[PDB]
Design a protein around this ligand. Sequence first.
Ligand SMILES: [Mn+2]
Ligand SMILES: [Mn+2]
Ligand SMILES: [Mn+2]
Ligand SMILES: [Mn+2]
Lengths: 103, 105, 78, 87, 96, 95, 94, 95
Amino acid sequence: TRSSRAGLQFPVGRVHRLLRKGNYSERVGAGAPVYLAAVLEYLTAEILELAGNAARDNKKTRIIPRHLQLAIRNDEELNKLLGRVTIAQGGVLPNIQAVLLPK
Amino acid sequence: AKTRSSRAGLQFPVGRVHRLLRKGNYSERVGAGAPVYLAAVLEYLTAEILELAGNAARDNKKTRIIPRHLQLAIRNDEELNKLLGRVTIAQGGVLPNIQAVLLPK
Amino acid sequence: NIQGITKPAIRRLARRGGVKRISGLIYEETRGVLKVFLENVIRDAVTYTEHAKRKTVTAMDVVYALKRQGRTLYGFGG
Amino acid sequence: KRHRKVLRDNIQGITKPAIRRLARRGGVKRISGLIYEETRGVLKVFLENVIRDAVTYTEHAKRKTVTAMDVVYALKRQGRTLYGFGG
Amino acid sequence: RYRPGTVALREIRRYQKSTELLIRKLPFQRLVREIAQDFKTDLRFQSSAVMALQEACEAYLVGLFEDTNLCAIHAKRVTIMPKDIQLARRIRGERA
Amino acid sequence: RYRPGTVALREIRRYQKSTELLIRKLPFQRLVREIAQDFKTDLRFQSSAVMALQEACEAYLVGLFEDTNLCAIHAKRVTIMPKDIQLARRIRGER
Amino acid sequence: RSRKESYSVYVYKVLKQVHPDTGISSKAMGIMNSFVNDIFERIAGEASRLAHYNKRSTITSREIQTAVRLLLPGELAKHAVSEGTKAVTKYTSA
Amino acid sequence: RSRKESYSVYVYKVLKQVHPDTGISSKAMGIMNSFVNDIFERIAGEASRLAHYNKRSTITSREIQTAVRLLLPGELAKHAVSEGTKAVTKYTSAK
DNA sequence: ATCTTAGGGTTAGGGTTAGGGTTAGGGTTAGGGTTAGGGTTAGGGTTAGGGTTAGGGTTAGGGTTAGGGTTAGGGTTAGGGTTAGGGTTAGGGTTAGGGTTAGGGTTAGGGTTAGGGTTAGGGTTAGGGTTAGGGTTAGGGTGAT
DNA sequence: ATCACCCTAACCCTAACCCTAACCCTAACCCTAACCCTAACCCTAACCCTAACCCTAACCCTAACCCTAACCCTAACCCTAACCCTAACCCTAACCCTAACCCTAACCCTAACCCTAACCCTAACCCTAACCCTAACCCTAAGAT
Ligand SMILES: [Mn+2]
Ligand SMILES: [Mn+2]
Ligand SMILES: [Mn+2]
Ligand SMILES: [Mn+2]
């Protein structure tokens, strides 16, 4: 497999097929699906990491969309990257403005 | 008629648009009527703009339309403003508007 | 059915948004703003359904319409 | 044929009168004194974000000269699509 | 008897630290089908498509409340008013 | 001697009614080359690319002033303050 | 050197039909060229997606038409969809 | 019926790497699938434009490279550009 | 604070459903080899951007008086919040009908490929018209008598 | 409320500079002929939605009260607009020269073309833990002595 040749879990072969089928360009370089499958795999790992840690602090083992939202909105970069995105069943980060706090 | 634009009653280039659709990586194949429909939609919208801009040029006593006349035409329409809402016309200036609270007593 | 989006249902959405005091005029203004949002999304979703030559508006049609509106939704097969 | 000169503190080149004019076009009557620095901060951020992408385009094109198109493509990326400089 | 703004603060924490939908599924499903009939008659909706619409609506409205509240606080207030919703939507690029 | 807010109102009409740039071309060209070199050295700028940047900046800032002014008017004021620029950028999704 | 494409010939033709006395500046012609190019890629891209979504290898005038309906308003869209089907019909005749 | 593609097999494999003593819900797997598909399109599309701007007929890893620099943040972008060139290098080593 | 009052987070127990570990095989990726062109080489033109001289007059910087917009006080009113019990209506629970979506087989035809042909339109040079910039022009409204 | 002066606006024509209408030549659109795979039919399987029943019970709704936020006015400084003058430095049209782009020539291999082969992952089934759902608890501040 091309994924094994690159040390990846993400499918290098599939990504290469989606790039030519998706109408992005006439030809697709040999290293482009490899670089891309790696960038996608990295970002997935980066998210899964912070999401697993959110479930670790809520006494759960399985990550639900709430854990994904908590991971995204608590990061600065993941929040900016997924700024105009809505995670279904994610809820909001708990924040109450200081002016609304009791006197 | 020998040009595809003449067959369709258009000023906009039907042949060129068909070439750009293929040469732009939008799909494997481009239908016969797609560049014709598109050249027509583009021609309609440019006529719609040119109309309101020439009107703003005639108000400013000018013979030639400058980017100010284009901006005035766009922002004074409701649909052209919505269509070009997140667009910036270079050398366009702003619509003259002063909030009522800032007006003298 | 616009009144089915009740005054208490609107108050819960304000609480999640971190709102302490809610004016009485708000409940009607929110109903207006929700109607606009729904119109805009469903209009494009249906335009997708009609292009697909279908009678049933699928989850994908609602997803594509949301991406067009810049309110991209994760989790519905996108 | 030798070397250039050092570039420093040019955000002060965006003077208080230049900031006033932009407020007038925006329909502003009274302009606080603290504004002039806050605007300089916000302009610097905007310019950084646009030039960063413009230069990323220039570097990808294997060029040393940032073209009008690179600034245009950078603006479209930022969602501040500009009409009149090509594209 | 609790003071004004004590059950309100309890409600905020109750809902923020939660993900359940805040509009009942049937009143919403009626509103969706009503609005749809205006664009096309004889319309069917996938169960999922309605839920995709409901999630989108609430997520939008909660975010709109967030900005609205910031507008109320900006004008030295604690209660959200229509002029705050309008200012939020105008600066958001939905209004003018 | 004009009253406070009489030359201000004249200035608003003077500038809204025009299209000329409101920042001098050279101070701005220095700022552009400073920012862009601090970031990647040995850079050249097309005359047009700098103008494309200047137009973009001013158009942005004028639009930012528009929203900022609406925030000052919202809090019963006539003068724009940093807390108005911040609120405008917060709601605009710039944070 | 290299030749540079432009919709200036057509923007001039269309200007005369509308205002036969009114002229156009070099900068304003640039703004018009940027307008045509932007809307071209806005429609073409939306039609490219429509064709993709419905597992189709071709962009036909049906993809252009629904792209118009999605991107421009009913009024502007209504008249563009009219002006469009008309030119297509006329092209099929000749 | 019809075949339905999914990145679930890989999201599971990668989950095992970061948290082997952690699992994933059906809805959360959908959110992860929507995330991968969105970012796939985001990068692919930006690279499609880069290739086009520079009159080139091929999307190479250099186009993916600069698309990630434009789309991802300096930090996340810095680590993605790293893991990317790394996987490419490793692939060139093994035939 | 110190007095009673609510309630929501806390543990623990035993319920239900869905992760996720299993199955076979469909269809996708992969490794044979042929073939064509896109992009990589070296190059020269040649533009164009950077910096250099040169001048001046617009435009900025910096402190002035004081005008009025900002923000403090308290005091008037009532708008929304809390609490409550009458009671509508949303929420599963679980049936069937049959229009809707669409899998897959045949057949045609629309869009692609091809090079020579020819027209449009890109670039070019060039006169004169619209616009530009410098002069006074009265009218106009501002802001002290 | 009456006059004085500062402003934009508008006349004058002179003013350059930009537009456009000429030119012609270069290339991209058009014609036409084989060219195949998409998309068009066709039917028909098997899907998923709607229609319409039930039983409370969570939830909506009106009206029980007073708390305190919004609002107003008045009056407190003090911040920011308006005026002036000085000398910068931005703008001006020059000047240059070479680095930096890119034409366009030559050749190689990187990519795509075909197929058949193993090999991964979909679609299924199944069980069993993870989480759900209840009760009674400690903890924690909530409101007022
Ligand atoms: Mn006052
Ligand atoms: Mn009341
Ligand atoms: Mn044909
Ligand atoms: Mn020409």
